[PDB]
Amino acid sequence: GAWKLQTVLEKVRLSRHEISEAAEVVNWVVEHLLRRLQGGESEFKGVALLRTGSYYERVKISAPNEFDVMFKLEVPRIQLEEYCNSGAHYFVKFKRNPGGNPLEQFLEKEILSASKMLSKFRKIIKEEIKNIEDTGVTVERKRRGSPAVTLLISKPKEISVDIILALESKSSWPASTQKGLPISQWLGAKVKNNLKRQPFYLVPKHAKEGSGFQEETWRLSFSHIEKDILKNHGQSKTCCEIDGVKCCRKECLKLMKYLLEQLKKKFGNRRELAKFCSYHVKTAFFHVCTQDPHDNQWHLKNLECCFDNCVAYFLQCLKTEQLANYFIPGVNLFSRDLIDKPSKEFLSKQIEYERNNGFPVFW
């Protein structure tokens, strides 16, 4: 193959060891923290580690010094109120409970308060980290527009860990997701039904930068579903297994992430590139899996054409300024409210240039 994509995949593979070692350090610290939370008497006594995200999907290809971790908390009887038109943001309310509400301390005027819950969450984390301060682990100061409590691990490696609190609701998916997860052709109706019977999650997200009740909103998270469709990505159950056939679906996702990350290193993460992240290419990739549902379309030998399909689709989204959230179709990740036109223009041009020259940024 002229692009020599197998050699590129070998290069990104080199990063694997560093990422696995760092992940062990992160897991040690977070397991300590979890055991403290679970042995305590706080509302967060029921938290558990939610093993999702790029690391557990095995597509974390970079940034061994940066991890995010999700703590899930089962919350019964949730009732959502949409913040606005989109389904991007919700207020969390509760349905009547004759047995009570363990989260009463966080209620403010009908609504579960995110700032109240996070303050208490941050407080508990800070006290547990202070208790083990000889370990060299500290809590980073609050960042603007970040729902996370960031841990700074200094030894034996410098690692930033974003701890994200996620509410778990074992209830029907909200109406905004009705035409979401369009995987029927790709994975089948049975798989789609099974996945939509899983719980959904809520993580704190500000609706707009203002000061006000937009500070109290939550966004949906389906990171556990994303993990499953990445891991069990074939029409056949033996796709990419030892006794099955190798497809190149994951390799393509990795190359798309790597493309964006190498462009940022090439250009110095300038203003135009700073708003694009791996979640945009992951979303584009899922839409491509839907348009090309068959395992034989992704046979390993077909790597160049498959990767080119992903790139071409991503180019089409940049030009049309349309990239629908895979679970919430009414949410456009490429709207002008989020990313201005010249930024899309600049990335389009660079991707077009890379494509026409065999992706020299990879080398």
Residues annotated within the binding site for Mg(2+) are 66, 68, 162
CB 168 within 8 A of CB 224: no
Which one of 4-12, 171-179, 271-279, 291-299 is the stretch in contact with ligand UTP (CB under 6 A)? 271-279
Radius of gyration, CA atoms only, the chain: 21
CB neighbours of 214 closer than 8 A, spacing ≥ 6? Answer: 83, 89, 206, 207, 208
**How would you classify residue 35: left for phi > 0, otherwise alpha for psi between -120 and 50, otherwise beta?**
alpha
Residue 117's binding partner among ligand UTP, Mg ion, Zn ion, none (Cβ under 5 to 8 angstroms by kind) is: none
Closer residue to Zn ion, CB minimum distance, 247 or 263: 247
Which helix (H) or strand (E) covers residue 111, if one does?
A: strand 111-112
Q: Which of residues 189-248 bind ligand UTP (CB under 6 A)?
A: 221, 223
Give whole-number Cα distances, 333 to 60, 198, 319, 320, 344, in Å. 21, 24, 13, 12, 12
Neighbours of 61 (CB within 10 A): 22
Among 8, 25, 37, 247, binds Zn ion (CB under 5 A): 247
From the list 166, 151, 176, the residue with the least C-alpha distance to 204 is 166
Q: Quick one: 223 or 262, whose CB is closer to ligand UTP?
A: 223
Rounded least distance, CB 39 to Mg ion, Å: 27
Nearest distance from C-beta of residue 147 to ligand UTP, angstroms: 9
By CB under 5 A, residue 234 contacts Zn ion: yes
Is the distance from CB of 92 to CB of 204 less than 8 angstroms? no
Of 53, 64, 147, 174, the residue at the interface with ligand UTP (CB under 6 A) is 53
Residue 165 DSSP symbol: E
Pick from Mg ion, ligand UTP, Zn ion, none: which does 324 bind, CB < 5 to 8 A by kind?
A: none
d(CA 281, CA 347): 13
Residue 53 is a binding residue for Mg ion (CB under 5 A) = yes
Residue type, 73: L
Binding site listing for ATP? 54, 226, 257, 278-282
Size of the site for Mg ion (CB under 5 A): 2
Considering beta carbons, is residue 247 or 252 the nearer one to Zn ion?
247
Count the residues of the shown chain that bind ligand UTP, applying the rule CB under 6 A. 10
Q: Which does 234 bind (CB under 5 to 8 A by kind): Zn ion, Mg ion, ligand UTP, none?
A: Zn ion
> Residues 2-41 vs Mg ion: string with x where CB under 5 A?
----------------------------------------
Q: Which residues contact 57 (CB under 8 A, 6 or more apart)?
A: 226, 227, 230, 231
User: Hey, how many other C-beta atoms are within 10 angstroms of the C-beta on 73?
Assistant: 22
Query: How near is the Cβ of 91 to Zn ion at its closest, in Å?
Result: 40
Residues 166-195 that bind Zn ion (CB under 5 A): none
Q: Check residue 54 for interaction with ligand UTP (CB under 6 A).
A: yes
Q: Which residues bind Mg ion (CB under 5 A)?
A: 53, 68
